[PDB]
Design a protein around this ligand. Structure first.
Ligand SMILES: [Mg+2]
Ligand SMILES: [Mg+2]
Ligand SMILES: [Mg+2]
Ligand SMILES: [Mg+2]
Ligand SMILES: [Mg+2]
Ligand SMILES: [Mg+2]
Ligand SMILES: [Zn+2]
Ligand SMILES: [Zn+2]
Lengths: 445, 445
């Protein structure tokens, strides 16, 4: 019954127990309860990047294989933009850092810098939307520091997530402006259409999002009773379990009750809700309740004699533990679908609050490591010098003293505090220059 | 301009020239014009198998890896059915027979034989629907002979296609009833829920469909001018090309014309039609017409001064070469979408007619090899003995005399002729037994 470790006490053991008991992985094989999430991501993110104008393709490091073809295909300005995406499998913590995983990576080349920069952020919005709209996970959109960007590019943009149980940042996905670096390496060039004396190099970007989203989702929403599945990616959204069946239930009445479960299932599915029944009567209803609790099914309908007689469903909401009575009539599928949208909203809100609570604005060095030790991320004033970023990570690792304990930069958030950074000195110990921005620091995955 | 070999004269060179000039493959890399087809298949077939109740998953020969897990997961009858699908890439003629390709394969295990048999045919209907409804390719649904089935199973069902240019059958996809063979190998078992003294073995099936569908599609519909893309899988369904622009076109009038192309594009896309413009004016309109002809864009809109003035689009239909005038007004997107549905219908009809014309019912041995040599498939009476099937292939190979020349069985069609087989002797040379069925024979891919 339940889960063998609390998140607050032993997070690694909690996570392994959850992913196993919820039937997400088999020691990895990705079983359907987890895979459905990836299928949802593929549909949703796939749709968005198609709609932007990116096309899918299949290639048998991606850049070393692809960019020679880009050179070949770009014969003149009329071949631009080249905008290609691939869904594939790249070759440990399951769904966080693994030897094999699935992802999507896009590579584009444009005639102008503006075009390339604009797509970089469009794609980042898509990734943000994945986390927020599908997975109910809040993110920080921002830009990586020089130190933390993708080495082959000009700048890297990111959606940074927060793992409360361990007080660590996790990079959610990234979108890179590669500028003209790679065109120079791979001899990607075209004649300027307005001046045939001159050769230009396209502006390239690349961007990827992987099954890491699933691990983030688990870590963000799971609780001490098990997984809590965001409803938009829950393979089963509602489980229907018969209750109140005893020694003295007549066969007429037992049949009716089971039949009503099937009927309910049918009515919900016809209304678009992913419902199913659990009619394994060799297990108690309690055992069945636990099984689906651990999986994180968003809603459980307990259908007994009185629910039948009163045409009134008893609904247990997994994330909140709340209980609702929902009328069983023509409006039931819409009502349940609305309750699933509220569930999304509430899960997102609760996670966002937790995130913001654990984002701590630190202006004095002496409070930096104690803040980390409170399992918080830190927003601190920074002058922008790499040396200062390096000193923060060194000094924080040395004061803290098997995961890393030094704090790195996570991103420079696009949404900056109202409080001006310029009023403060750069955060590093002994530093004196006026800050120019706030940057988000933390211990990280 | 155009294609360098006729289908009727050198089919291999024709096919290579098409797939290259239509930008389908790069020597394979699957470029978007072809990949979009696979994306369409994934959506359509994916949807159907989800709706049947199959779930997707990810495993790092599939049976040797998967079936031990099936043994593990099936702890009792309450774990059945296990119904799992994977979209992945397995490791020459591009899209026909290649070292690497993409496919989908499903593996199910059920408690009862009836359940397993029923799904086998449901899945086969899905595959038939792929070819027919997406790709406008006709098929023969049938059962493989004992000799031609998947060796590990009890029986194999198939959708067989016909390649007219070379007079050969091509297996389109297969769905296998594996019975209890594999459960015995892999110790997949459960206690009979109605008798706990007894152990039962589940009934399994497996089924796959690959990017071979794309090669079949090309071979079936392509003509001597290039590819002809079925409209439901055409990445671009309508191409808009400006025409009638001369030395003396004023800049006011050139701007208006280009703007009207963009506007048309916008109006069609808003109505659900995949339209785009080709405004590369460094090429003649003729050159542009050829380029999209070779790619097989279903409809071309030629938008000139008079089309603008008369609010009347000149539409060239790729498969038929027909020309239509389509009014440019509020109804244009629906009208064009309807014309694209007619295009689907017509392509399917023309291919079906060709197929049926080349299906020849042969009752005398002496006409068998000459029929093959007419680039036809053959429906012939068969007693059902493997020996007779073997003799047909031997005798046909010996009389015909670098592809194979012997005829194999393709399938026993579920749709049998009205003419009773029993009226005839088995087809093989010298054979004497009354036939029990008609079977489809041919030279094959
Ligand atoms: Mg730089
Ligand atoms: Mg905390
Ligand atoms: Mg200060
Ligand atoms: Mg047998
Ligand atoms: Mg012929
Ligand atoms: Mg006879
Ligand atoms: Zn500084
Ligand atoms: Zn015979």
């Amino acid at each position: 019954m339940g889960i063998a470790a609390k998140r607050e006490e032993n997070f690694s053991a909690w996570y392994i127990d959850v992913i196993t008991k919820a039937e997400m992985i088999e020691y990895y094989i990705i079983r359907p309860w987890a895979y459905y999430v990836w299928k949802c991501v593929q549909r949703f993110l796939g749709g968005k990047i198609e709609k932007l104008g990116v096309e899918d393709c299949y290639f048998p490091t991606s850049e070393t294989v692809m960019y020679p073809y880009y050179a070949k295909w770009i014969r003149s300005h009329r071949d631009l933009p080249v905008r290609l995406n691939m869904w594939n499998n790249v070759i440990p913590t399951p769904f966080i850092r693994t030897r094999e995983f699935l992802w999507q990576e896009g590579h584009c080349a444009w005639a102008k810098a503006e075009e390339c920069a604009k797509e970089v952020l469009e794609i980042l919005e898509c990734y943000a939307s994945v986390y927020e709209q599908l997975l109910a996970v809040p993110v920080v959109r921002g830009r990586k520091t020089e130190k933390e960007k993708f080495a082959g590019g000009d700048y890297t943009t990111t959606v940074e997530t927060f793992i409360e149980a361990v007080g660590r940042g996790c990079q959610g996905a990234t979108s890179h402006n590669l500028g003209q670096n790679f065109g120079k390496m791979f001899d990607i060039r075209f004649q300027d259409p307005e001046n045939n004396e001159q050769t230009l190099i396209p502006w390239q970007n690349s961007w990827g999002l992987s099954t890491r989203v699933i691990g983030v989702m688990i870590m963000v929403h799971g609780d001490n009773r098990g997984m809590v599945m965001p409803p938009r990616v829950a393979s089963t959204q509602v489980i229907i379990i018969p209750v109140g069946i005893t020694k003295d239930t007549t066969e007429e009445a037992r049949q009716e009750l089971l039949a009503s479960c099937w009927r309910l299932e049918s009515e919900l599915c016809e209304g678009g809700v992913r419902a199913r029944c659990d009619l394994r009567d060799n297990y108690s209803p309690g055992w069945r309740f636990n099984h689906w609790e651990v999986k994180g099914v968003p809603l459980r309908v307990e259908l007994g004699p009185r629910e039948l007689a009163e045409r009134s469903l008893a609904v247990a909401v997994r994330h909140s533990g709340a209980r609702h009575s929902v009328a069983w009539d023509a409006q039931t599928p819409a009502a349940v679908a609305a309750l699933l949208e509220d569930v999304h909203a509430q899960m997102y809100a609760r996670a966002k609050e937790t995130m913001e609570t654990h984002r701590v604005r630190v202006t004095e060095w002496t409070e930096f490591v104690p803040t980390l030790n409170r399992k918080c991320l830190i927003l601190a004033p920074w002058c922008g010098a790499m040396e200062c970023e390096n000193q923060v990570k060194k000094d924080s690792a040395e004061e803290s003293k098997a995961p890393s304990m030094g704090a790195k930069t996570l991103c420079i958030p696009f949404e900056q505090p109202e409080e001006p950074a310029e009023g403060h000195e750069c955060i590093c110990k002994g530093c004196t220059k006026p800050a120019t921005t706030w940057v988000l620091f933390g211990r990280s995955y």
